[PDB]
Amino acid sequence: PAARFQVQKHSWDGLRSIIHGSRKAPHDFQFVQKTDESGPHSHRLYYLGMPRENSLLYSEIPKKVRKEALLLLSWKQMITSYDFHSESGLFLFQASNSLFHCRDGFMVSPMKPLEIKTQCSGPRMDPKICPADPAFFSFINNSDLWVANIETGEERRLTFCHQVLDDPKSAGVATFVIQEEFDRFTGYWWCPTASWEGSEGLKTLRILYEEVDESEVEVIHVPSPALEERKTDSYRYPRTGSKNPKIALKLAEFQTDSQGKIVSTQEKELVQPFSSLFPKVEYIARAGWTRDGKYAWAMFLDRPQQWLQLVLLPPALFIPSTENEEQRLASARAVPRNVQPYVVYEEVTNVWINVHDIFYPFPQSDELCFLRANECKTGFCHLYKVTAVLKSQGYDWSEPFSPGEDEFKCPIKEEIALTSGEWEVLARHGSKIWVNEETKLVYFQGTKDTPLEHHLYVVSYEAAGEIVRLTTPGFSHSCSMSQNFDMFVSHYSSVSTPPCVHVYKLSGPDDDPLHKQPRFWASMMEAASCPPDYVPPEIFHFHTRSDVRLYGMIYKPHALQPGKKHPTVLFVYGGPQVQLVNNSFKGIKYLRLNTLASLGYAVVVIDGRGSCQRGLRFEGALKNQMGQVEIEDQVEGLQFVAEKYGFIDLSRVAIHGWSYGGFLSLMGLIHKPQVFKVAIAGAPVTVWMAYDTGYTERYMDVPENNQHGYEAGSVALHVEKLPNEPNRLLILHGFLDENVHFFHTNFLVSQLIRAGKPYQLQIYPNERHSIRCPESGEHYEVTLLHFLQEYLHH
Amino acid sequence: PAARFQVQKHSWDGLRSIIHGSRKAPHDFQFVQKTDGPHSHRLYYLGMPNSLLYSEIPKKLLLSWKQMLDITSYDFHSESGLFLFQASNSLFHCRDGFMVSPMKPLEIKTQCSGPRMDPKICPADPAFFSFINNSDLWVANIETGEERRLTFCHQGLVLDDPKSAGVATFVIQEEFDRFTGYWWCPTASWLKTLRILYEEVDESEVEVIHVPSPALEERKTDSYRYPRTGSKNPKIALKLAEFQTDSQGKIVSTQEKELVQPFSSLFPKVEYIARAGWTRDGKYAWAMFLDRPQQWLQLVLLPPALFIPSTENEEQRLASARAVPRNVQPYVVYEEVTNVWINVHDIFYPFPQSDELCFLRANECKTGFCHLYKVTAVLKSQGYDWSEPFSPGEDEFKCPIKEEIALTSGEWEVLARHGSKIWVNEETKLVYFQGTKDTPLEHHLYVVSYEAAGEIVRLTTPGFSHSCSMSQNFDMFVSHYSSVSTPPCVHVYKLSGPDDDPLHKQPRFWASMMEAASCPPDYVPPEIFHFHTRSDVRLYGMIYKPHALQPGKKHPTVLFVYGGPQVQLVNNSFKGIKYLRLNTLASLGYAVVVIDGRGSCQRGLRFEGALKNQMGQVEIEDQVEGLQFVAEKYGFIDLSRVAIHGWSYGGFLSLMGLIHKPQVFKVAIAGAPVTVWMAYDTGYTERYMDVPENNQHGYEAGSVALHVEKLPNEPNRLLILHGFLDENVHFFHTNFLVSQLIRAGKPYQLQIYPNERHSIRCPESGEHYEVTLLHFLQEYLH
């Protein structure tokens, strides 16, 4: 009868004004101690925030608090990233199209940023202060590594692998598939210490860097942002099965005198080619140095991404690069048989290695003690104290050799578990740990309390004992520690409450540092006013028929009258490396879901199997079958919501999602036509044989080994099982999308025409993957409202 | 009143079976004589069940389409009976004793990497034949197999390799309809040397734009040189490629030959080489030169002796510069000036000499109507020192014209554009030609004497548009003729009668080759009409009446539009092959109106010239004036429900109509629309719309994407179709319009044809387009 709820239909200009209507935080922290204890302030907080548009700001922390009274802090003025040197108070930051610096006695009010000059050509990307001497700093220029000296003003080039498609070589740069899939955004690493090699005079500074050759990498053309010019940009995009770049790790020594001038520069290659010491190493995932600089290190993945290994590389293993086959052998004979690369840690899986950023090697007294995160051992990411034996087996470096299985594999002396259980230590997505050697405590975030909340915990690396939570529960926290471990910040929020940024002081007796109370100290930002119509979503949980727990959000139809069945937008992603259902504010990222709710739509969200923050075997439901598992968990999760809450009309379900969610949306419409009446597919993956290697191979093997899997999970190949009926499929895509190439939309549209199927299509000519410009976003949300308003019926 | 007609609303699979229901022509004729003898002549031509076919013409019913072979175009050489053509991506040949059963196509071997484009036989000696390969001019020998490269403008990289010889550039092919950049000399000189005129071209300073490749899978773009209106056109020059051959048929020596003074100093203000060739005696090479404005044209004669061998030795060159006689000189033999634009006309037939030069030339500038002229020209050598560098201008080489007769006159045109041609019988002193003398709605065959502008006799029978080709011996002609109601036939006609009265030789039907094949059983043809505007200017329209009509019912109307220059949709020829979908649109009960408004073709230059500098503005007001008349004369138009539709200019005119006249048009379906004239090329735009620096106001006003704010705020009033691979009207236009629509908060709907360029060629794309068109109108034209 009048059981069904019909949404108030609006005019276009009405829908536009409803969406314009619904549009009406600090980060990148550095703690510094004051060390003038006759004044009112104990610390200084440097950070990045928009007072509008991003900039560098400081705040003063007082010694005595306001007692029983909440204390805000003024954001005092003085830019996506910056580098900092705590020993000298020197800030280096890429701003405008150049580089800028500034010092911090402690300044009163803003100082003007002194610009660093250059005789280099283009922009100076990826700048870093030399930790060993803050007189120096590095940068990339035209795909090559440079070094410069702020004081004297002297720039020098250190690599020469570059001068378009006849220039595939490049040094100190992270290739595309490393940036987008392995989340590394540099390919050079400062040696933290400064050796004094030779006989008399000079100080040697070293830089580890990734040399790279993208010749055999397939080229593809994405349209140029400047649409007027009608040109394209070339991309070294390797597709699944095709060849990744040829890689190598290489050294860059350069000596400098006392008066601060650069004397000698020198490229250095591995004594035996990278590819011969490490056959079956495909991607350098991460790299760095040990605290003392005794060994530079890297994490090497194999192509099927089922085999990680941390390896040390002593500088001594590096000889000067020359083309003289004669000369090469001399320096090769000059390398002692002691010196060698030591493969320390090794992670093997039947699923896939997720890269984990956590690796803290301890200085040596012979052996090597270090902290490592490891999700392959128990199926859940946990800290471990690993000791490894560096025993030199004595190599002749002048004659070549093939390594044999575990050639450089170190004997493990001990390997302690510092955490355990079916939760995980946050180790991907920029999550870092903080180690205090004064007290032998290690600070980490994790899901210990619940998957839906990120929390700060401390544990001792001496004794794997009591783990103390420091963040207050009922919220999810992103945390940053002080270097002095006396204070920490938390950027936190909840489904109901917008984000705040509080400063805390760890307080109490020092003879028990584990059990230091986290006392609230001062606030950096209090919860902003909720949007006028913002009712928060309600998190629920249910069990699949296979007895495996699943979490879901729901956005209640605002002003609900029980007994009325509402039409339901199911919002989806349901792909790896993501969690949509967690106890943190969603209003900034997803108010569209609220806007939908407010016009009387049910908006369900469901983290099906194959999503983040549930350990490995959960993520592993995907393995070699993308599309074939995730959609059943959505149906179940939707059906459950229809039983628990009474307001879901199942006759009118609208699956909508972006990227993998765009992919799932179409898969939903294909495999479950009687369930979902309409699909809205945003920037969908339509053909997996077209997507890139790092991502696709990791989850779906290579097309040769997973023929049946690639084809079944490619929606363009199954277009005949899309609706014969119009107004059941809306495709949205950003022309300029460099992750999911427009080709996918294009190829699907080509396939729909051959199978005689109808479709609506929308294009974002200036947007890429993420819709950035407001106007484009408004138009997107209005099209969504309008499409559902006319078509989500029957 | 419940007199509003509602079209039967179908399911999609329903609409699809209606469009699949719907879908359920020889050219390039060459006459040869048998000179024996049961058969007289023999027709050679192209055709499908696409390749070479022949028909045996009797001495005394339909004709048998025989086969030659075991193909777009061929070259033929009557003397040797040699056929050269481009089947596959290779080259083949064959001779026509006079064969009874089909012989095999003999293949030509090659050293060359890529394909062999633009193949032509040497007229002087059929043993030889030329071709382009990696944009350079090559010469081969069918008999020996010996190949030889003449021009050396290409390396092996692109974008660093801009120069090229013997090729027609982009704007030259798509806006001047010249498809070759070389021309054989039809004679030889004596060992014997064989000349070729060719265009060397430098596209160094032409703006590069990228376009997606047909192979979407590889994901790579092609790089064109597309010069946008206001930007630089290619640097060009005419050149001579000579080569000697000994008696055995070997190439013993070649030679690049530049003009003794650089091309840009001899002929300043020349931007494009529209056409070129030679006189029948090979005495003079000739070219038609335009200026960037395209309001100035001159026909030039280049004597070979004005060409000197290329060398870096600037003393050796000076040696040659001295050796070119002061007599020899370029002769500007004709000049066409105008305040509107110079349409390029193919008709130029010089008579052989033995100081005078007689020639026939089509001229539209003179009287505003394209007509044949007999022109005697004084070639009086002025004397020049070619050793001294000098800069002439304007009328240095301008010849005195001694006579200028008009062989035709009357507010109609002689057809001379897009490969229309005259046939000249020098024996009978008659020039056969095509024309609109009887009516603009039909293309008839006429003869006049080139001696005296006397009686013009018509040969083709009235009621039908005709396309004809004459026997080289002016005894017979074919006519590919059709009409609105009747599909195309191909009839063969014999010019019988007294030889002592040639002008009045009567065309007497001899034999048929093709007979009008039955229409798709649901086909009811359109009917032509005319009306006058408020300016009392006559316009022609077609209409497709709603099938099975009930008088007193007003039907929903689809105004189909082009309205752009160089085109005429309304005339008396069968439209139910290319425009079958308009009949389907009728068969569902839509009225479909087509109106050739001002700016359109076949009504002379001032009717076309209404567009000048105002593209968009003049065109819609005419389309409405028609539409309004249509509703009054035929009482079945529901004006409340009129859709607009069109491709290219017609997409541009739908978007204009929905901007300038929303009260009239409820919807627009714009296909491959030109949304920014400032983005379009020089060839087209600069002609009609001047240059952006000059006509700022007119460019802005005619760009439908600078006026998006005035598009509908209602959804379902605008559908944008576009071929992703369109190389004429780049997808960018759609892209730019979509970006402008989003800024302004305006709804659109988009259909992409990812494998189609400007025209939809693939059947499935075409069916989907016609199903989407029908679905869109069924739901939203209400």
Measure the CA–CA gap between A641 and B207, rounded to whole angstroms: 59
Beta bridge partners of A384: A372, A417
Cβ separation A219–B220 shorter than 8 A: yes
Instruction: Characterize the bridge pairing of strands A145-149 and A155-157.
Output: antiparallel
A50 CB neighbour count, 10 Å cutoff: 11
Closest to A760 (Cβ–Cβ): which among B212, B739, B749? Answer: B749
Q: What are phi and psi of B759, to 5 degrees?
A: -100, 140
Element (H, E) at A372: strand A367-374
Resolution in A: 2.9
Distance, CA of A277 to CA of A602 (rounded, Å): 58
Q: Decide the pairing of beta strands B665-671 and B637-647.
A: parallel
Query: Nearest 10 degrees: CA dihedral of B578, B582, B584, B590?
Result: 180
Q: Which of A724, A660, A661 is nearest to A691 (CA)?
A: A660
Task: Report B:223-242 residues touching A (Cβ under 8 A).
Answer: 226
Residue A576 CB partners (closer than 8 Å, separation 6+): A610, A611, A612, A619, A622, A699
Contacts of B212 in chain A (CB under 8 A): 221
The domain made up of B27-514 has a fold known as Methanol Dehydrogenase; Chain A (2.140.10)
Residues of A in contact with B772 (CB under 8 A): 758
The nearest CA of chain B is from the CA of A513 a distance in Å of 58
CA distance B260 to B238: 12
Chain B residues with CB under 8 Å of A703 CB are: none
| Residues 6 or more apart whose Cβ sits within 8 Å of residue B584 | B18, B19, B22, B522, B770, B774
Tell me the two tokens of residue A357. 């950023």
Return the DSSP state at B537. Answer: -
The values of phi and psi at residue A696, to 5°, are -60, -50
**Do B742 and A776 make contact, defined as CB atoms within 8 angstroms?**
yes
Report whether A487 contacts A504 (CB < 8 A): yes
Query: Contact at 8 Å (CB) between A184 and A201?
Result: no
* Helix (H) or strand (E) run with residue B403 in it: strand B401-406
Residue position matching structure tokens 């064959």: B94
CB contact at 8 A, A658 and A683: yes
Query: HEC string of B447-492?
Result: EEECCCCCCCEECCCCCCEEEEEECCCCCEEEEEEECCCCCCEEEE
Q: Are A272 and A319 in contact (CB under 8 A)?
A: no
A766 CB within 8 Å of a chain B CB? yes
Eight-state DSSP code of residue A88: T
Tell me the residue type at A749: V
- Residue B513 structure tokens: 């080759």
Count helices and strands in chain A by DSSP H and E runs: 12, 45
b/e per residue, A697-713, with b = 16+ CB within 10 A?
bbbbbbbeebeebbebb
Q: Give the type of residue at B49.
A: P
> Which of A16, A230, A750 is opposite residue B209, by nearest beta carbon?
A230
Residue A331 assigned ligand-binding role: no
B764 contacts chain A (CB < 8 A): yes
Sequential DSSP letters for B357-395 = EEEEEEESTTTSS-EEEEEEEE-------SSS-----TT
| 3-state secondary structure at position A54 | coil
Q: How far apart are CA A393 and CA A407, in angstroms?
A: 10
Looking at chain B, how many residues does it have? 782
* Chain A residues touching B220 at Cβ < 8 A: 219-221
Q: What amino acid is encoded at B488 in this protein?
A: P
Alpha-carbon distance of B656 to B649, in angstroms, equals 10
Q: How far apart are CA A184 and CA A307, in angstroms?
A: 18
B163 φ, ψ (degrees, to nearest 5): -65, 160
CB A554 within 8 A of CB A604: yes
- Tell me which residue has tokens 């120069």: B163
Here the tokens at position B250 are 């070997």
Q: What is the Cα gyration radius of chain B?
A: 28
User: DSSP per residue over B581-650, as a string?
Assistant: HHHHHHHTT-EEEEE--TT-SSS-HHHHGGGTT-TTHHHHHHHHHHHHHHHHHSTTEEEEEEEEEEETHH
Tokens 């500088």 belong to which residue? Answer: A315
Q: B593 is written with which tokens?
A: 């109106």
Give the residue numbers of B marked as catalytic.
648, 726, 758
Check: CB of residue B651 under 8 Å from CB of residue B619.
no
Closest CA to B575 of B597, B544, B537: B544
Answer yes or no: do B210 and A220 touch at CB < 8 A: no
**What strand order describes the sheet that includes B285-290?**
B272-278, B285-290, B296-302, B331-337
Interface of B with A in 11-50 (CB under 8 A): 11-13, 16
Give Cα separations from A747 to A658, A741, B214, B388, B645 (angstroms).
17, 10, 12, 63, 27
Sheet harboring A136-140: ordered strands across?
A125-129, A136-140, A145-149, A155-157
How far apart (Å, rounded) are the C-alpha atoms in residues A652 and A661?
A: 19
Q: Please, is B770 exposed, middle or buried when counting C-beta atoms within 10 Å of its C-beta (0-12, 13-18, 19+)? A: buried
- What gap in Å lies between CA B597 and CA B368, rounded to an integer? 18
Q: Which amino acid is at A61?
A: I
Please give the structure tokens belonging to residue A65.
């608090």
**Which residue in the set B219, B736, B753 is minimally distant from A220, CB to CB?**
B219
For residues A403 and A379, the answer to whether their CB atoms sit within 8 Å is no
Give the HSE-up count for residue A780: Cα atoms under 13 Å, Cβ half-sphere. 25
Closest CA in chain A for residue B779: A726
At position A549, the amino acid (one-letter code) is R
- Residue A210: is it exposed, middle or buried by C-beta count within 10 angstroms (0-12/13-18/19+)? buried
Give 3-state DSSP helix, strand, coil % of chain B, rounded to 5: 15, 35, 50
Residue A726 forms contact with B (CB below 8 Å): yes
Determine whether B105 is exposed, middle or buried from the number of CB atoms within 10 Å of its CB (0-12, 13-18, 19+): buried
Phi-psi region at A785: left, alpha or beta (left = phi > 0; alpha = psi -120 to 50): alpha
SS (H, E, C) B307-351: EEECCCCHHHHHHHHHHCCCCCCCEEEEEEECCCCCCCCCCEEEC
- Distance CA(A592)–CA(A19), nearest Å, equals 8
> Is B186 exposed, middle or buried (CB count within 10 Å of its CB: 0-12, 13-18, 19+)?
middle
DSSP string, B73-90: -EEEETTTTEEEE-STTS
Would you tell me how many other CB atoms lie within 10 Å of the CB of residue A599? Answer: 19
Task: Assess B160–A contact: CB distance below 8 Å, yes or no.
Answer: no
DSSP track, A714-734: -TTTTGGGS-SSSSSEEEEEE
Q: How many CB atoms lie within 10 A of CB A81?
A: 12
Angle at B775 between CA B774 and CA B778, to 5 degrees: 85
Which token pair is B744?
Answer: 């302004």
Contact assignment for A761 to B752 by CB distance below 8 Å: yes
Which chain A residues are within 8 Å of B216, Cβ to Cβ?
Answer: 743, 746-747, 750
Q: How many CA atoms lie within 13 A of B387 on its CB side?
A: 10
Which residue is listed with tokens 């830089």? A207
Residue A518 pairs in a beta bridge with A506
Pairwise CA distance, residues A760 & B779, whole Å = 14
List alpha helices for B391-450, DSSP H. Answer: none
What are the CA-CA distances from residue B203 to residues A327, B177, B212, B237 (Å)? 49, 19, 21, 12
State whether B738 and A763 contact (CB < 8 Å): yes
Assigned token pair, A193: 């210490």
By three-state DSSP, how is residue A792 classified?
Answer: coil
Q: What technique determined this structure?
A: X-ray
**Among A219, A724, A763, beta carbon nearest to B750:** A763
Contact A735 B736 (CB under 8 A): no
| C-alpha span between B142 and B95 (Å, rounded) | 12
Interface of B with A in 183-222 (CB under 8 A): 208-210, 212, 216-217, 219-221
Architecture of domain A27-525: 8 Propeller (2.140)
